[PDB]
């Protein structure tokens, strides 16, 4: 404890010198930049100094300012000698305080002579005593490296935020104190309360690095790992506790890209535990993985092939059988779990398509793992007895029409079939290769397009696009019936296969352009034009149809406008 | 953005990071030899308990006994211990300081012999105190799982076994034959299996990510520095085959035959053909890497450094094989004759010739061609 | 439900009405002669605002029931005590509570 | 592969050279060590194991063949195709149904047939002396303790009254001495031993405990305690088994309880097997016969298994406090 | 059999196309069979 | 008092009065969140009052003012006659 207090003193004074010296550096850099702008008609060397002092990364320029560690490179730094002497003197003082340099004259000498004399006097037979005395020896001999280990957890904050960090640390302490307790109802409620307080804290987004250093993401990961660990037997215990888990973890990934990287370091556990996480209404570990992989190409290219294989095999399993929870609730037995595969397809979409550019490296692996197991595609697209997209979707419409199959509702399986196939076609057209790769004529890109065109024909795409879509109908006494919008057909399903149709099987000939224009496109925009009436204007179907049009249909027309000549 | 508009607390955080990196990390300290010498001194026990000729272990001996005890403790796996990791580093530096030396005139016979004696004494200060047994116990405890423990234990084993000293070699052989433990050699076999090779797909992914521009959270950096995903565990695999070479150094036929055949032990693992298997795997990986670079006559700097670290691993594996067969040990020679060593070196000859002409054509690849010829002479 | 047994009389004129802090050195003893509470071991008088509902109802009544410096025995029946569930690990369920109350001061 | 159920004694049909290196094609008997049965060919069940009484030289005779061709063995090589001697039938796999092998039936039926499969060769690996001795005592203890169980069940529900029970007398002395031997055999390593020696002997005791638990001595001891605990007192046990068998009933109860404790001490798997038997030990804590023994069994289960503390109930805790009361 | 091992005779192999990326398959759906490149796999003895 | 009872009562006091508090403080001891206060600015590495060799003479461990943020210890007075109280976590 005494030596830990010494380490605390060293860290605190390092922060103190940080404040004192960075005030000087900030003022001097501002004055140098002002004088260099006051220098009119800056030369090439002056422009290099200007782009070093200004319009440069703050980290890079502060390293360039502190880079006078060695006398050979001291000439490169632009800081004054009097200013840099302060840093040199405090470094010397820090070495003196760390002991770098008869009776002991310091805690370090006292502990060293104590432990050496003790182990010289007798063979200590208590392993805990041996470990403690040699740990004391290690820290006393190199407390400088102990400072190296301690500084990652050193984080200076503004004096005005101290009350919010008080609340943050108190809630984090509650979370840590509940670790040693077996999770019960009261502990779960306290954990949810503390997690919500951390969410509502302004520091949680103001200083993401503070939470990264505190490792509270690791702490809530420990809580979540314990929770799933017990949940893996039979049903998951305290689903709301896992809801608060990613609620924090999902958001933590969105808070920062480095936070997203740290959460992506534990991507492997999330993928193997997505099997038990699936079926839970709330944010699941698969969603943590999605949040850890969304819109970050740096770690998207770092995504691994067996990591893709896990989600592919789970998608295959959901395709192979039916949802046990749905069977328990009493939904008609089908041998086909669409809601299970929907979320894995969602994760695959996020794994492939990022920042408006599909990753070839991951798209090829995803389609390879998809094609080695045709069981992923469900009863449709099957090697034999797979019918087609048209038969599957139209039969699903008939399934949702009657209560014999639709009724056992929170989740309607008639909508589930359509949603799974929409997500599957979305993932396929979303793994589809790039236009510039096709123009370069890359063999693998042509083969991937060939496989997709072999799996899904143009007829199935156009026929479902032209499939009738029930509109909100105004019955008696102004009683309109807006479509269920979660149990029935939605143009969001059509949008994914429109994306397919424009990514592969893209518009090349005018006749086929018109073919698809009068089949399922022109009726769609005419239906939206009729839906523009004020009674149906705020209709949920109207909003969904407008989004579908303006995101899938209309850009196709904009990019195929040159083909419209001579119509 | 310039530092004048930065908030003071953020500037202090960045100054902490910059100080951490560029001042105190760059500053180096030397305490290992002093601390190990203080632990090795027994103090005044020779005067305090003269009646008993055999006395209690000195502090260093108690330290190694504690580590050996934690190694032998029944476990399902090995856990992380900063204590053992730091002490392994300290003792390794202390006993290999003489090997490290802590245009030039050549060393006289007396000078080099005195340096060898200093190395032998530094290594004796650890292997008379059970470090040779401790490193074997740690390697057995790792159970083939890579990590900081097996890394530090392998570095410590190299630091004890530098120069191939017969005392440490004989002590390790005695412990292995006395315990008849298959765990050590099973762990070693699993370690060569977990050692990786050139990953060309990872090279393509790394190249695309490097060409991609990105932004990190604090400030803005064009490309955040990260370890190369290709030829990972390069230090670990070079260290593992260096440790095996030090085990069979000095033409000790007892270790040279014990690696091939475990006569006393129930299960026999042929570490020689495991080394051949990893050599063939690395041969295939280098062949694939060259074949990808065959069309591009100009090799990128990333490809050059990746080739260099790959051929450094191959150089260490080849030196390990020489050591396995450097003495006229008929068993190892016969096993290498009957293994796939010839197929692997056929592939090596193919890659060598094509690198030779292709790197000779380009004048900027002369250093890579030089290190290539060094690998070929191995 | 609650009876006050005078052990030592005080002044008998100023009684704590609604709106002030009551400062008391009680000695809570069980139904069974087994003491479960006292304040002089903590060397701290129990200061509580009257009528703010932060003592057991029986103790609250017994405190208004007496005057300054007037030692008394507050017999708190389980009905005016914890009662059905008791105090976990302190008072067993459905027990009579018997109090050596001592109103030492008021503010 | 580490269980006693995979232990086969290889003994030749000829007694004079019953201790020499087995010859190729030599007619030799193959016996199961744990069950005491013999590998035999019956026309109704194919390749099975039968009793020694039904074992004949025409059924249990098996010879090791160098190859499947029609017209000395060593560990580590010489993969031998086991073949019957009376017939030309070869020890060969029977492919199970795809549904079962998908559920996880990795075991395949052993049949005798001229399949000629390349994997019909076998690898011979000698087990350790520890496992050999353990399997032999498992066989002997199982036989003796099932004899005790059937003896106790013979007079169950039959008050003997005038005269002792008509059935054979219980092997009381053999059971008592076998229990004492088993307690000495599972006696934990001494703390005075060195660290490495203590942990090596702890590992040896660990695997011996796991072996007996897996072959089912734990359940057989449970059966013996269940059979003995029907009788409340020694006199009540005398009313059914006889006074000449009643004096040692208390001693057998104590010995069974401490054998249970010695089997479960320091064995996480053996205590987790007692998760369903936590109520079994809680309801028997009140037993006057080896109250310390049953309390010790409960103590070992609780200290080793963390699972059982999650199924500890209020009635269980009330029983444990009733032990104090 | 591992990746990069020599192809002994009588060994069961799987022959995947390079362009189509489809293992050779024996359909056996009809009374008479067919050989065709499919994403499923079928074993081939590779007999010289 | 007998020694086993001495140790038992000492550890009983620590367990019922100090255990959760010391565990929470220990869990905070890992991290060093230093506020940017004038007290922090005044915190010197070597004794600011002393100078030269007197300054180089190390101060005692812990006497100096520590400003790194630690959540304050919270306790609830032991009362078992109060009105009977989803509930907030009980304090030590």
From Swiss-Prot, chain A:
Tell me the residues on which Phosphoserine occurs: 358
Changing residue 453 to H does what?
A: Decreases threshold for channel activation by K(+), caffeine and 4-chloro-m-cresol. Decreases inhibition by Mg(2+)
Location relative to the cell: Sarcoplasmic reticulum membrane
UniProt modification remark: The N-terminus is blocked.
Which tissues does it occur in?
A: Detected in skeletal muscle (at protein level). Fast- or slow-twitch skeletal muscle.
The outcome of changing residue 176 to C is: Decreases threshold for channel activation by K(+), caffeine and 4-chloro-m-cresol. Decreases inhibition by Mg(2+)
Which family does the UniProt entry place this protein in?
Belongs to the ryanodine receptor (TC 1.A.3.1) family. RYR1 subfamily.
Q: What else is known?
A: Binding of [3H]ryanodine indicates that the heterozygous channel is activated by Ca(2+) concentrations 4-fold lower than normal. Single-cell analysis of cotransfected cells shows a significantly increased resting cytoplasmic Ca(2+) level and a significantly reduced luminal Ca(2+) level.
On subunit structure and binding partners, the annotation says: Homotetramer. Can also form heterotetramers with RYR2. Identified in a complex composed of RYR1, PDE4D, PKA, FKBP1A and protein phosphatase 1 (PP1). Repeated very high-level exercise decreases interaction with PDE4D and protein phosphatase 1 (PP1). Interacts with CALM; CALM with bound calcium inhibits the RYR1 channel activity. Interacts with S100A1. Interacts with FKBP1A; this stabilizes the closed conformation of the channel. Interacts with CACNA1S; interaction with CACNA1S is important for activation of the RYR1 channel. Interacts with CACNB1.
The name on file for this protein is Ryanodine receptor 1
GN (gene name): RYR1
Curated annotation (Swiss-Prot), chain C:
Q: From what superkingdom does this record's organism come?
A: Eukaryota
Record carries keyword Transcription regulation? no
Question: What catalytic reaction does the record list?
Answer: [protein]-peptidylproline (omega=180) = [protein]-peptidylproline (omega=0)
Q: Which GO terms describe its biological process?
A: regulation of cardiac muscle contraction by regulation of the release of sequestered calcium ion; regulation of release of sequestered calcium ion into cytosol by sarcoplasmic reticulum; regulation of ryanodine-sensitive calcium-release channel activity
Any transmembrane segments, and where? none
Q: Where in the cell is it found?
A: Cytoplasm; Sarcoplasmic reticulum
Citing just one GO molecular function, the answer is: peptidyl-prolyl cis-trans isomerase activity
> Which family does the similarity line name?
Belongs to the FKBP-type PPIase family. FKBP1 subfamily.
Q: What is this protein called?
A: Peptidyl-prolyl cis-trans isomerase FKBP1B
Give the organism the record lists: Oryctolagus cuniculus
Swiss-Prot record, chain E:
Q: Where is the MIR domain?
A: 4-48
Miscellaneous comment text of the record: Binding of [3H]ryanodine indicates that the heterozygous channel is activated by Ca(2+) concentrations 4-fold lower than normal. Single-cell analysis of cotransfected cells shows a significantly increased resting cytoplasmic Ca(2+) level and a significantly reduced luminal Ca(2+) level.
Instruction: Specify the species.
Output: Oryctolagus cuniculus
Top-level taxon: Eukaryota
Record-given protein name:
Ryanodine receptor 1
Q: Which family does it belong to?
A: Belongs to the ryanodine receptor (TC 1.A.3.1) family. RYR1 subfamily.
On tissue specificity, the annotation reads: Detected in skeletal muscle (at protein level). Fast- or slow-twitch skeletal muscle.
Q: What does this protein do?
A: Cytosolic calcium-activated calcium channel that mediates the release of Ca(2+) from the sarcoplasmic reticulum into the cytosol and thereby plays a key role in triggering muscle contraction following depolarization of T-tubules. Repeated very high-level exercise increases the open probability of the channel and leads to Ca(2+) leaking into the cytoplasm. Can also mediate the release of Ca(2+) from intracellular stores in neurons, and may thereby promote prolonged Ca(2+) signaling in the brain. Required for normal embryonic development of muscle fibers and skeletal muscle.
Taxonomy of the source species: Eukaryota, Metazoa, Chordata, Craniata, Vertebrata
Post-translational modifications: The N-terminus is blocked. Channel activity is modulated by phosphorylation.
Domain topic, free-text comment: The calcium release channel activity resides in the C-terminal region while the remaining part of the protein constitutes the 'foot' structure spanning the junctional gap between the sarcoplasmic reticulum (SR) and the T-tubule. Pore opening is mediated via the cytoplasmic calcium-binding domains that mediate a small rotation of the channel-forming transmembrane regions that then leads to channel opening.
Q: Where in the cell is it found?
A: Sarcoplasmic reticulum membrane
